[PDB]
Amino acid sequence: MVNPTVFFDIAVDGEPLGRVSFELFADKVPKTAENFRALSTGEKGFGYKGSCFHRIIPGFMCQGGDFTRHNGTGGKSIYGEKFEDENFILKHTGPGILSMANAGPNTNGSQFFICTAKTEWLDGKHVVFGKVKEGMNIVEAMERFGSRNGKTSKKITIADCGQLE
C-alpha cells in the first residue's frame, strides 16, 4: 500500500490562489490520517469543502477545519464528535507539518493546522499526521493575510478538495 495524498484548492475572497497537496502518514497514524482523508473527499456527507482558515499567524501556522461553526469552536471527526490522541511518534520539526488542533488530551475533531516553522513546544500534545507534499508556496502566500492576533484580512477558503492517490 501507499500513503494517501489529498489536495486543497485555496481561494482568497473567492479568487483562486492555488493547490496544496499533502501526504498523510497512514502507516504511522492510520486512524488520524483516515479522518483527514475522509473529510477531504466529503464521503460521509460533510467535510472541508467550502470551509475557511479562521486563524493565521505569520511565522507560526495556518489553522482551519471548523466546518460547522467556522470560528474555532466547531467541527467533528468521522468517528463521532471527538477521538483519542492516536500516538505522538512524529514531531513538529519544521515548515509543512500537518497536525491536529485540540482542546486538551483526547479531543481531536476536524480542526488542524499547517506549520510554517518548527513548533517543538507542541510535541507530545498535538498529533502530527501529515506534511505538505507540493504547494508550500501557496501556504506562504496564505500567511500574508494573517496577523499577530490570528485574524485574516481576507477570507481564505478551501474552494475544493479531494484525494489524488
Binding site: 501556522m61 489553522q63 467541527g75
Partner: peptide, 11 residues
C-alpha cells in the same frame, strides 16, 4: 503564547 486550541485560545 502560541497554542492551537479549539474554543479558548490561550496566550
Amino acid at each position: 503564547x502560541l497554542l492551537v486550541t479549539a474554543g479558548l485560545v490561550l496566550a
